């Protein structure tokens, strides 16, 4: 497997321990308002998702260019990444629609010559084992990153390639191995062509198939995004699963890799409204919600190093998120640099920062943040 | 109460409902499965990637079903306010008439939670007429027996639209909605109209029965999903009471109850979706419980669907017959008896015992 490059921070985002280091990961079907652009530009690192303002600009490619330009005019130090899925042919890319229309052989088929699909039964996959597909995909990423207001790319679906059962259950064992081989070739290409840019990947993840829970695959990338971080599987308890995720993240962060930890608040916010009635306004000062914020931030702070950033979200679509435009009080208070690594005692972790003491209990899913 | 257009019904075994879409044409085996149900609703996005549109995919599917079993009743889904995709005629109508879509007071489109699906402005007469004719034209085709009218509750709960387009516009949407339902009640009087209408709601003193006069029956969803601070058991008590009243009056009931949560197994997102053992003891206890809720309510022309979503290609129960669907059921020997949260009912070949509080049931087949 690809080895990690010597650390070069030249192209990394801004970072400070002064207050919570924050990540943004977002889409909207129409253009952001001026207020929303100002909000985006306040984050040190922003990923622009798929379906980026396509109902204003006609396509994600043009919506991305317009959004990134507007962000950079407000804060040219903000780093902006372009989302790209390595295997799933999601909608609203004008250039992908044209490529697939003209070249139907670009899509992935099973051994019986049938197109295979995501669970919606309609979104197909790029057959990245084909040279012309690799070249199209690599050029699409390189061309977008080369534009003036894009700093790098967020590569998604690495784990669908690398967990053998995902594709072997669709296209067979040999085709899965071929998809994996081509994936590694394509990542090697980007590691070189984007060496003056940033590459973030959705890669660190507790998996029985990954001996090092994704750390073994970080060699191509400047860092990892994390999801599924508190969603246990494989018969593991929630606490056992988080213990492994925390260990992987600590090791990655301490190696100098960017970490963008995402943790969902959607379950803590949902109030059984919004389907056939108005979604009831959420009290963002609610005591119980803020205990959940403390808990999720404690998980993050137990792992964090320089270039670690957090997003507590209610989905990535701006117009359907109850936390859009909101700054929790925990994001404004003085944090300060760590005074040491986290200390682990069973499922209880503690960590000291210059202006904050963290206590975390994974078993009870509780934490205390004692701000100084 | 004219029953001449109603579906077939038998108590011999479980009376079953099907409610389905697929992005491409059904296989022959799938058509045979559909034709085995007495009542089938064809959802939106109906084989549009084979036939080019939901309109033509519906026509092809219905024709094939009726060729296998001409007694099966087939309903066409139609949403009264949401402009969902894949209707070629709606796309043409909306392209030509952008003013057909609902806008707020600043003339901005308003949307569903996905931020991209808009709504018909049914306050406009030309929109009412387009919509009504679209339903009447499809129902007039030879292999379609009626329509499934969806999103009634989004019109009738004032906050749904008032929070989007203001209080005056919601009141106008509601007035127009009632005019449209009165029109369909008359034009489809030789056909079937099923509506997604019975629902426990604080806004509905009778939990949807007060609107049921427009329709031949109700589909039920959200039936075991409590809200409004109510307990799960009391929420079900109120839904059961509404459903019993409707069914006893001769209205069609199509009860849908999700198995998705008892089937989900924490796989299938980034790995292969592991098989659910359809013969598992725990899954079968869940089936028993959901069927017991149905059987406590059911009358002639009540039908049940225990589902894993309406998309055929993503459902673990597609093509499957649980053993509980094959065993002799027989006619009820009396109405259900309620003793607290425990209900009992006797059928010729089955005794039902249901406890809402523990979410368990016992089906004693004879």
CSV table of C-alpha atoms in Angstrom, one decimal, chain A residues 33 65 101 106 130 164 166 205 208 275 277 285 332-333:
chain,number,residue,atom,x,y,z
A,33,UNK,CA,-27.4,34.4,-0.2
A,65,UNK,CA,-17.3,27.9,-9.6
A,101,UNK,CA,-24.8,9.8,-22.8
A,106,UNK,CA,-18.5,3.8,-19.1
A,130,UNK,CA,-11.7,1.1,-18.2
A,164,UNK,CA,-14.6,-6.3,-0.9
A,166,UNK,CA,-19.7,-4.0,-1.6
A,205,UNK,CA,-13.7,4.0,9.5
A,208,UNK,CA,-13.5,-5.6,10.3
A,275,UNK,CA,-43.6,15.6,7.4
A,277,UNK,CA,-47.0,19.7,9.3
A,285,UNK,CA,-30.4,26.8,23.7
A,332,UNK,CA,-17.2,30.8,20.9
A,333,UNK,CA,-15.6,30.0,24.2
